[PDB]
Symmetry: D3
Subunit: 338 residues, 6 copies
C-alpha cells in the first residue's frame, strides 16, 4: 500500500490564498487529498476567516493533481439549494475528472442562520438531507428531472455539464442512524475522530446499510477527519489548541449556536483536559504516527488531518518527513473518486 | 491594447473555456465575462458549468481580469449574502482582478427552485435590495438586514479584501441604468442601436452625478455577439445553429425551458440578427464595429463569438483586430 | 342533418358584435358556439376581451344555439372552481340542454394578473383534475365539503342546479389529460393538429372512457380550428398575419404573460408558419374538404374561428357554400 | 316621470322566473333591477342562488331596464377585484348607460365557501377600499399594476372598456363607509332603516362627496327595502315569516356561514321583529306612503323586494296602484 | 352518599366571588366544581371572564373540592396543546386526585381574538383529536416530538408530572366525537338535552370505549345543566332572560364572535325558548326530580349552573333541600 | 423597614414544595416572590417546571406576599400577549396591590417547543415592545383591536379588570431595552452583574423614564441574584455545581434548546466560573454585605435564589441572620 494522507484546509482560520499555497506544498510533501470546510463564518473571531469554498476548489483543481472534497456542504436549502450543489459538484468533477468527492451534511446554525429561517432540530435536518440526496441523485442522471417532496421543489431541470461518471456522494455524520442511511443511499462515509467504541459502531452501521442495499462496503470510502496540534514543544501544542480551536474542547451539541461571539464566550470555559480524544496535542511525531495508524487499523481508508496551529507550513513538512512515509495502508483500500 | 472575451457557459465545456481564456490572454485579450447560467438557451448549445468554481481556476491560471455577466443575487438560485461572500473571496484571492456583475435574472435559470417569478419591474426592486445587502456585507463588519425581499441575521464577511470588488449592473433598462450610476460602480449593457446605447450612457451619468460621483472614471461596459468564420456563409450558418436566441428581439425573461427556446428558434432567420449578431468573415468589418462602440464611449467590450470555432476566432482577433483598436489612453477599467 | 360550430373570438371582437354575429350564424345554419374565456387578447392589435360569463347569458336568451366555454381554467387564479360550477349550473338551468362546460389548464396571458406562482403544465393538469372533483361534487346538488392539495371548499351546495348537469368537456392537446378526460369527464375538445396527433388523442380518450365503463362513441369529440376566408387568397393571408400571428407560433405559449410579448414575437411570423394551423384561402371548396377530413377522423363537432375581421361575410359564405355540403355521421353525439 | 326599482331575489327564485318577472315588471312601469350576488340562500326554504353575472346578460339582452349588482363583494373570496372590473366593463359595453356596479364588504354565507380567514367588518371595509382602487385603475382602460396590503395585480388592461365607465355604487349601512363612498365612488346603496340612521348615512355620503370636490345632489342615493304584499294582511305576515325570517333578525349576520344556521335562528322570529324592516300589508295605499316617505328623505331610487312567492301578482298590483302615484323630484340622479 | 357539582360561571361572576361561593358550596355538600375557560362573556350584561387557570390554583389551595375545566380548547388559538398539558399536569401534581382536564372544540367568542382562520366544526374536531394525541404524548412524562396536520412539537418533556395523569374529559354534544371520546380519552361531559340525545351520546361513548378494550361503566359520564332558582317563579324566569339569554338560543353558536352580537340576538329570546334548556322554578322538589332523572339515565356527575346572581342563596337552598335527597348509584365513577 | 424577595425556582422544585417554602419565607420576613415562567428546567438534574400561572393563584390565596412573573415572554410562542394580559388582570383583581407582571424576550429552552422561527435577540425585543402595546391596550379595560408586525388582535376586552392595572416590569440586561422599559413600562428587573453594568442599566432606565415625563425615583428597580448558602463553604460550592451549573455559563444562552444541551455544557463548569454570579459561602455576613451593596447602588428590591435544595434551612438562616440587618431607603418604591 503506497504512501498517502489527507490535509484538512481550515477555512475558519486561514486566508484562501494561504490555503492554496499550503495545499500545493502538501502535494509536494506526500499528501494526496484535501478536505475543505464549507463555512460562511468561523467558530470564533480569533480564527478570523471563511472563504467561499466553491471558488477556491477551482483554483486547487487547476494548480494541483490532488483529490479534494467538501467536508461538508449542507445542501438543505439555507445557504445552498440542493440543485446548485449538484451543479457545482458536477462542474468540478467535469473539470477535474476522478478528483472530486461531494461531502454533505445536516449543517450548523453558525453558517445557515444568516438567511433568517426556521432551524429544524437535528433529526428533522437529517430528513431534509435525505431528500436533498434524492434531488442531487436525480440531477446526476444527466436527464431532465422534476422533484416535489416535503422540503424541496424542483421544476424541469437538467445538468447539461455532467461527467460520464458522477462524483461520489459522501455523508459527514456522527449519527448511527444517518451512518446506516449513508451506506444504503450514498457512496461513502466521513466521520470525526472519536473513541474506538463509537468509531466501530458507525463503521458497523454503515456496513449494515450498504449490505442490506446489496452494496459491498469494503469497496466504499470510510473517511475520518481528525484534529491534532503539532508544534516544537508540547506546551506550545496545547497553547495552540486553546487559542485556535477551543471549539475542539466543546463536547456538547453545537449545531444551534448562531454567532462567532457566542463560541468566543463559551471558549473561556475550555481547558486542556477538554481536548482528550478530540485534539491530539504533542510535539512527538512518533505519537502522531501511532495515532493515525490506529485509525487505519480500525478500517478507515482515508484520514484528513487538521493541524489547529497557525504553523501549517512547518506541520506539513514535519508530517511529510516523519509521519506519512511510515503509515501502512492496506494494499487495495478504496479512495473517494470516480 | 486590449479587448474582453465572453466565455459562453451555455455552449462550451468549462475545460474548453479555461483553455481558450488562457489562449485569449496570450493573444491580447485582457479580461473575461462569464455567464452565470444553470441552463443553456437551447439543447443544441448543450452546456452550463457552475461559473463560481470555474472562476477560481481562471484566476489561478491567468492574470486576466474577470467578472460575472451576470449573476442574479435575488434569492432564487442565489441568496445575496452568498454572492457577496463568493465575490469577496475571488477578490481576496485575485486582488484587483474581479468585478461582480449582477442583474435581474432569467426564468430559464431561476425557475428551477419553483417560486413565484415577479415581473421585471419587481425584479428590479429585488435587485436594488440585493445591492443593499451586498454593500452591507462589503463593509466587512457584522451587519443585519430586513427588507421587503431579504432577511439577513447577524452576518460578517471575515474573508474580505481591503478594497471591495466593483459592483457592475447588467441592464438595458433606462431606469436601472440610472440607479446603477447612483448605487453601484459601473454599467454593463448588451449591443443595441446607437440611440439606445447613448440613452443608457446618459442615464448612468445622470445617476452618478446626482450621487456626487464622477462617471468618466466609472466602467461603461458593453457585451456584443459576433460570428466570425472562414466565409460569410459559414458565419451565418453558425449564428443560426448556435445562437438563434440572438435573433429573438422580444422579452425572453419569462421563458422557462431550453426546449421552449428550441421550438421558438425555428422561426429565426438571418435578417433577425441585424444589429444583434455581426456575421462576417471580414475582420476589418469586425474592427470597425468594435471601434464604433469605443467611440460612443464604452471603456470595455466583451466579445462573444457564437461559432464553435473559438480557438480560430481568438487567433484571428489577436492578429487582425485587437492590435488595431484605438482606446482612450486613460479609460476606466473594472477593478 | 346540417350543422357546424362558430368560434366567438373575444380576443378580437367587441361582445356586441359577437352577439349579433352569433344570431346571424344561427340563421345561416351554424348550431353551436365556442366562447373564449380570456382576460387579455394575445396582441393589442386584436384589442378585446369581454367577460364571457355575462355574454353567455345574452346569447342564451336571444338564440337557440348550443354554447360552451372554450375554455375556462377553474384552477383558482381568475376563477375558483366553485364559482365556475355555479356559473355552469346557472346557464344550464336557464337554458336546459344547451350549455357545455369547457375547461382547461389555462394560460399565463390571462391568469398572471393575480400575481401568483404559475406551475408547470404537468402540475396545472393535477390542479385541473382536482378542480373537476370539486365541480362534480357541487354538481351532485347536495351539501359537500372538499379538501385537497390545491382547493378547500367549506360546506357548500348549489341550490340552483338543473336535474341533469351540463357536460364537462376538457380542452387539451396532451395525451395524458385526454385519457383522464375520457375517464373523468363527458367529452374532449382539442385544437387542429396533424392526423397522427389527432388519432392519438382520440385513441387515448377512448381508452380512458372504456376503462371507466363508458361508451366513447356516445361522448362528444370536438375540435377547434382556425381558418382565414376572404375574397382573395392575398387578403386571406394578410388577415392571418395581422389578426392572428399567434396562430403561426408552433411553440408552448402558456408562460408568456403580456400582449406586448406576443406582439414582439409576432414580428417573426410569416405565411409558411400557418401551415396545418390556419387554412388561408378564398376557395370555399378547400374549406369544405378541410372540415370534411376532420369529420372523417371521427370528430362529432367542429368549431371554426375565422381570423379576419370580415365575420359577417365569412358567416354568409360558409352558410351558403360549406355547411350544407358537410356530411356528418347520422348518430354523432353532440355536447349537451 | 313614473318609475320604481324591482329587487330580484336570487335567494328565493329560479333565474328563469326572475327573468320572466323582470320582463313583466318592465311592462308594468318598473325601470330598473337590483340583483343579489349570492352563492347561498339565507335558508333552505328560500332554496335558490343563481350566478348573477350570467343572468344579467340575459336581462340586458331582453329588456331596456337599468340593472345593478346589489351587491358584489370584490374582495378576493368568490371574486377577485380585477374579474369584477372586467365583468362590469363588459356589461356596460354591451348595454351602454344601463349597468351600475354595486359593491360591498360581503357576507360569510357566500364567501366562506373558499375556506379563508374571515376578517372583522372594519377590516373588510379596508379590503373594499383597496378593491375600489384596483377597479378604478382598471377602469382607466390602460395597462396598470397594483400592489397593496390585500391585492396584487400584475400588468393588466381592460381592452373591452366603454368610453364612460359604469358607476360604482357602495352598498353599506356603516357611517364610515358611507362617507368613503361619497369620497371615492359614484353613489350609495343602503337597506331600509329608521329615519335617524338613513339621515346619518345620507349626511355622511354628502360630507364625503363635498370634501372630495363633488356635488352629491347629482349622485345616486339608493335604498333597498323589503315588503310583503298579499291579498290579506294575515297572508302577508305568514309570507314574511316563511320566506324572509332573516328580515326579522335585527343583529349582525355577516359571520354566519350556513343556510341551516339561519334556518335554526329563524325559529325565534315573530311578526313584531319585522317592524321598520318588512312592511306587511295588503293595503296598497300603505305601500305607497311608505315608499313616498323614502323619496321625501331624499332617496333618488328605491328597489323593492316583495318577500312572498306571489311575484307576478305583486308586480301587477304595484304597477296599477303604487308606481303611478309616486312623486319623484323632477331631475333626480339615476345610477348610470 | 351525598354530592353534587357546582358550575362556576366565569362569564358572570368576579373570580373572588366564585372562590368564596365554592368555599361555601363545599360547606353545603357540593363536592366538585366545573370552571368555564372563557376570554369573553356571552353578553356585556354577564360582564366577566377571569383566567381560569390562575383561579384553579386558588380553589385547589383553599378547598378539598374536585375541579375541572369545562372546557378548554387546546387547539392552538388561545392555547397551544402543550401548554394545556403542562397546566393540567401542574394542577394534578399540586392537588393529586382532584383535577380533571375538560377539553373541547372551542367557540369563536373566545378563540377569534387571535385573528386566525376559524375552521368549521368538523375540522375543529380533527384538530381536537390531534391535540389529544399531543397531550397524551406529554402525559407519558418522557421526551416526545410531534408533527401532524395541525401541530408541531419539538423535543418536549413534562418534568413536573404526577405519577397518574389527570383524566381527559371531552365536552361534546356530537355523536361522532362522543364515540371518539370513549375510544381515546377517559370520560364524557355533555350539556343538558332531551332523553333521546343523551341516550345516543351515552351509547356512542360506550361503543367507543368497548371497541378500544375499555370498561365504560368505570369511566365518568358527566352532564352540565342550567337552572334558575329564586324566591318566586316570576323572579326565576326574569333572571334567566336577563342573565342567560344564550341558554334560549337553540342554534349553532360556535361562529359568533362578539358579546355585542349575542347581546343583540338576546332580544329575540323569550321564556318558551328555555324549555328543556333552563329549568326555571322556585319549587326545589322540581329541581330535585330534574336532577334525579339525569342520574337515572346513567350520569355519574351533574354540574349545576344557577343562572341568577343569587349564588349564595341558591347554594344554601340546594344544600338544604336538594343535595341530601339525590340518590346516586353506590359505585358510580367520579372524574379522577 | 425589614424585607427581602424570595426566588421560587420552578426549574428545580416541585410546586407544592415552593408553595410551602413561600409560606415559610413569609413567616421569616421575606415580603415578595419572583416566580420563573418555564416549560423546561435548564438541566434534567434540576428536574422540574410547573405552570407558574396556576401556582400563583395558590400563592395569592394562602399568603399576603407580593409576587410576580420573572419573567413571562408574551411574544406569541408559549403565550399570546392577550392571554398574558388576561392572566395578569385576573391575578391583580383577585389579589389587589400584590401582583406585578414581569415580562421578557424569552429563551429557546422554553419557546422552541412550538416549532417556530426563533428570532435574534434584537428582533425579539421588537416583538416584546409590540406585546407591551397589546397588553396596555387590553389593560384600558375597553374593547380594543390591534394589528402590527407580530400580533393581530380582533375585538377584545378584559371584562375582569382591576381599577388599577398591575405594573409591567421588564426583565432585561440590555441597555437599549432598559431605556425602553423606563419609557413604556412601570419598572425594571435585571440579573446580578458588575457595578459598571448595573449602573449603566439604572442610568438608561432613568433616561427613558425622564424623557417620557416620568419620575424614575418612584419606579421599581429590581434585581435578581443567585447565592449558595450551606453549613460549610465546601457544601455551598458543591450545591452550585450540582444544582445551577448554568449560573457558571457567562455566555448567551437564549438559543439553546434542550436540557440535555445544558447538561453537557455543564461538564465544563468549575467553581471559578461562579465569580460575581453565584455567591457561594456559609458566611451569612458575606451574604448580608453582598445584598447591602446592591441596595446602595439604588435597587429597591432584591429577589434571592438559593441554588441548593436546602431551601427551608436557607430561608430560616436568612430570616435570622440577614434580612433584619439590611438597611433599605425609607420610602423606596415597591412593585405594585
Ligand atoms: O487585464 C489585466 C491584465 O491581464 C493580462 O492578461 C493582460 O494581458 C495584462 O496586460 C493586464 O494587465
Ligand atoms: O344545435 C341546437 C339548435 O341550434 C339552433 O340554432 C339550430 O339551428 C337548431 O337546428 C338546433 O336545434
Ligand atoms: Na449569457
Ligand atoms: Na381563444
Ligand atoms: Na340579498
Ligand atoms: Na430562571
Amino acid at each position: 500500500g503506497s504512501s498517502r494522507l489527507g490535509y484538512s484546509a481550515s477555512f475558519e482560520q486561514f486566508h484562501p490564498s494561504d490555503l492554496l499555497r499550503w495545499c500545493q506544498l502538501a502535494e509536494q510533501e506526500g499528501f494526496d487529498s484535501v478536505l475543505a470546510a464549507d463555512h460562511f463564518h468561523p467558530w470564533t473571531p480569533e480564527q478570523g476567516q471563511s472563504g467561499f469554498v466553491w471558488a477556491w476548489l477551482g483554483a486547487l483543481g487547476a494548480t494541483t493533481r490532488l483529490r479534494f472534497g467538501t467536508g461538508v456542504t449542507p445542501p438543505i436549502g439555507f445557504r445552498y439549494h440542493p440543485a446548485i450543489v449538484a451543479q457545482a459538484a458536477a462542474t468540478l468533477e467535469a473539470m477535474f475528472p476522478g478528483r472530486f468527492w461531494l461531502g454533505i451534511g445536516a449543517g450548523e446554525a453558525l453558517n445557515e442562520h444568516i438567511v433568517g429561517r426556521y432551524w429544524p432540530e437535528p433529526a428533522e435536518r437529517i430528513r431534509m438531507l435525505i431528500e436533498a440526496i434524492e434531488v442531487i441523485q436525480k440531477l446526476f442522471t444527466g436527464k431532465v428531472i422534476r422533484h416535489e417532496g416535503v422540503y424541496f421543489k424542483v421544476e424541469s431541470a437538467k445538468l447539461y455539464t455532467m461527467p460520464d461518471v458522477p462524483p461520489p456522494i459522501i455523508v459527514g455524520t456522527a449519527g448511527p442512524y444517518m451512518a446506516k442511511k449513508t451506506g444504503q443511499l450514498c457512496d461513502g462515509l466521513l466521520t470525526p475522530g472519536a473513541n474506538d467504541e463509537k468509531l466501530r459502531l458507525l463503521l458497523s452501521r454503515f456496513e449494515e446499510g450498504a449490505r442490506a442495499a446489496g452494496k459491498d462496503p469494503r469497496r466504499m470510502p470510510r473517511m475520518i477527519q481528525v484534529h491534532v496540534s503539532w508544534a516544537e514543544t508540547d506546551e506550545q501544542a496545547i497553547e495552540n489548541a486553546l487559542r485556535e480551536w477551543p471549539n475542539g474542547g466543546m463536547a456538547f451539541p453545537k449545531g444551534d449556536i448562531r454567532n462567532p461571539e457566542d463560541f468566543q464566550a463559551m471558549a473561556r470555559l475550555v481547558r486542556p483536559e477538554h481536548f482528550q480524544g478530540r485534539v491530539l496535542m504533542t510535539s512527538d511525531l512518533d505519537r502522531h504516527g501511532e495515532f493515525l495508524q490506529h485509525l487505519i487499523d480500525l478500517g478507515f481508508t482515508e484520514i484528513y488531518v487538521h493541524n489547529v496551529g497557525r504553523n501549517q507550513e512547518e506541520f506539513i513538512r514535519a508530517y511529510g518527513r516523519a509521519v506519512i512515509p511510515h503509515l501502512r495502508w492496506p494494499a487495495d483500500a478504496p479512495v473517494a473518486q470516480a
